[PDB]
Design a protein around this nucleic acid. Sequence first.
RNA 1: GGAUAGUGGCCUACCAUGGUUUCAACGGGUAACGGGGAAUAAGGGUUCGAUUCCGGAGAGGGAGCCUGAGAAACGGCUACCACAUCCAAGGAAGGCAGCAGGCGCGCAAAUUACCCAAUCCUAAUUCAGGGAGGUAGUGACAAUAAAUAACGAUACAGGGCCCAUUCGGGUCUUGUAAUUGGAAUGAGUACAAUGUAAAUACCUUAACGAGGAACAAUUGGAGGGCAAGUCUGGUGCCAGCAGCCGCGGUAAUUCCAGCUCCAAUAGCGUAUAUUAAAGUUGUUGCAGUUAAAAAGCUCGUAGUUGAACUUUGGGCCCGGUUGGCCG
RNA 2: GGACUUUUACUUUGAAAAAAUUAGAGUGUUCAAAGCAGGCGUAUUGCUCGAAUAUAUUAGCAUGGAAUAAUAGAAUAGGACG
Lengths: 60, 144, 185, 67
Amino acid sequence: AKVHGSLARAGKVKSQTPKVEKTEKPKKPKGRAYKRLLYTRRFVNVTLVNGKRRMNPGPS
Amino acid sequence: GKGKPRGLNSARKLRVHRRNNRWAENNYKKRLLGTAFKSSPFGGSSHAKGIVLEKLGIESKQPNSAIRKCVRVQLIKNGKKVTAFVPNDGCLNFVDENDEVLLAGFGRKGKAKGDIPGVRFKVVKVSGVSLLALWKEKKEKPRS
Amino acid sequence: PRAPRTYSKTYSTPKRPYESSRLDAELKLAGEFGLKNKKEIYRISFQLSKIRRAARDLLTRDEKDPKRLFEGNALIRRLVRVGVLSEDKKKLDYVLALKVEDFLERRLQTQVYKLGLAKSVHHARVLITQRHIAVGKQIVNIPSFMVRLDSEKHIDFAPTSPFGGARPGRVARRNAARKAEASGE
Amino acid sequence: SVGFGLVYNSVAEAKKFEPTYRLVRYGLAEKVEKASRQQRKQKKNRDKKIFGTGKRLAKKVARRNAD
RNA sequence: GGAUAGUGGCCUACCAUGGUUUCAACGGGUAACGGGGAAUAAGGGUUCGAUUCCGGAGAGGGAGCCUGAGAAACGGCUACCACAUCCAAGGAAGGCAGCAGGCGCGCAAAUUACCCAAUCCUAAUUCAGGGAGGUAGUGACAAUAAAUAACGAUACAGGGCCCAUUCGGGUCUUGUAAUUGGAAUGAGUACAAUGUAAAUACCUUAACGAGGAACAAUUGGAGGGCAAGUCUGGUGCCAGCAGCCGCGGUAAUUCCAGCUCCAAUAGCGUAUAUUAAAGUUGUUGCAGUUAAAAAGCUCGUAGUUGAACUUUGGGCCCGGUUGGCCG
RNA sequence: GGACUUUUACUUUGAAAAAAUUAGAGUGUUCAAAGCAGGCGUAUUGCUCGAAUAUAUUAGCAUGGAAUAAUAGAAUAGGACG
């Protein structure tokens, strides 16, 4: 099938997507400490039980 | 006992037969005939470099409807020609013709990947630098 | 032209990649014992898995087979010396039992806590790795050291460092420097 | 700190039975340093190209300073 | 008989017609040096070994040979073929598949450094010599251990929990905190001594070295298989994704991004191959009515296979090895 | 020492058997991959444990077995022992 299409538009969407810079945020602990934070998150303090559980909910 | 000779001295016939029917195993055949070397744009190697002839815009198969940016490439080691897709958004912006690129397989043993017909390869590096670092911003395409 | 300096690896790695349950349990072990890698668990579960293998192979042997006797009993005495195998259950059917937790709980990491000195497995870590505590006068800074049962009586502090005398340390003395240079002369 | 120690039954026996580098470490032996290893080798390989004492060749190449 | 150090069609002379083969000769292929081995873990297997030890072969290709106990030697010679260096044009020289280092090739691989101090070898020999061998450099090949933080106070919130007629906060801590608090340590820097032939690191250790501008973790993923959003913004069958099923044509749970989250973690992605999964090569252990596959039919040689029956039955001794009830 | 013996396959035990590698015992390289060390006193004139075991099949040797499965024999007796 056709081989010589149009290359005029390559890189279109990325180049026309509004640049939002990264947001400067709290330092996240590198190492055993991240696993610590993870444990106390998942299996110590418990956020919710909306039916079951949600590891990453938004608005609800 | 269905065909196969069960006797105590019929080793010969059994392994012979085993060879015979080994030949119906596609990758046994191909590994034994030498196809990896004989055919195949790469020489059986994992990767191959080569120069860029022209820039192609390959309309994808059905039921998809787009244009897949590629290049025609002549492999240095063995002069064979082959067309390679240029991954990610843009990146056909990174090449230019007569450029010296680095091709790898598409992870299907031959077999074109998605909706891209007859493209069994891809671009990994150009001009000495990695296409990825270019697409991000880590690095910049060398002189010429 | 020289001899091969031999080596081997100490960890295996789960067949299934994302089995949510095993991830749960693994995590629990990590946070409970203060481990930084799932590797630190994998490692153990590999070591153990070799033991068990050696165990199964012996169990198939005839009772009072020379190899079963010598090597089986050798393995048994070995698993006793550390503190994983109980003196009660001591005839290689429990070594076919066993579990990772029994291994985990025997680390210097775990012992330098379970009887004081830490108040948290993490403070255990940070202490050990910072040239504090010793067995003999021999300082050890490896979280996974495994306390060898009869050394349990010697997990004190180091002849150096604070908490066991010899010197306060550069920070304390920097503060002493600030007091002595400000509040005095 | 753990290591090893010798103690000889003389000072002549020590100066004769010891590695020379040790004597250098202590205070009993100069370090008669010499031309580099490849310097030495190269000097030998120069030396190989000559048969005899050499003086006859030097004067015969002094005969060259005319013709 | 000759020739060899010697056996032999090894060669010559005479003489005969023999030698191998479907139990596959002979020929071809090999991106084929052989072995110890290696990768893959139910077993049986499959795959691989140029490469630290052993054996063989070669020194650009071939032949020929001197010396010698030993070479058909190449860091020996001779000739030819290819290559190629210097010149005063008459000539003369070279052989890195030793150590480096260079060109070429490519997807693919480090220093033109130091030493004989160890390990050992050779010589007329304790000394001399050894790019054998050791030393460091370059080195995310593969392998091991495993820093990136630990602990109080306090601001409201809690779940605990006795009391509840009802303010509540009260001291057992769950910890989310946009003010805090003093503790701790090596990464690095650096006396010293140690290390070393001399050095360099390491193990030691004076003076130094942590508060977020830090000494600041990364690589992928968040529709399914597959752990983790139905968040905001962008694009609008375009650009892009997507191993595979599929997403995108104006509310995109797959694209470009921010946020949040997951997974593995000083490492993670990818491409090629291979092994397991694969009872999809099936001896263990496959399948052949209709899904892939019984030859139109019978003979039949090589091959595989092949009914039953020939000292069975009784008696006595000898001395072992566990184990039981006692010790 | 003299005189003769039908041939096998199977199985057992054994010898002959390099190391490294693997399986594996011992020893706290501070742990660990490793290494084959080391451990003890009179630490001013020594004392001493080691440096294992296993596999190493096919073929050849050696030894025990006598089921299974082949092979040979006395019919034109040209037989057996004396």
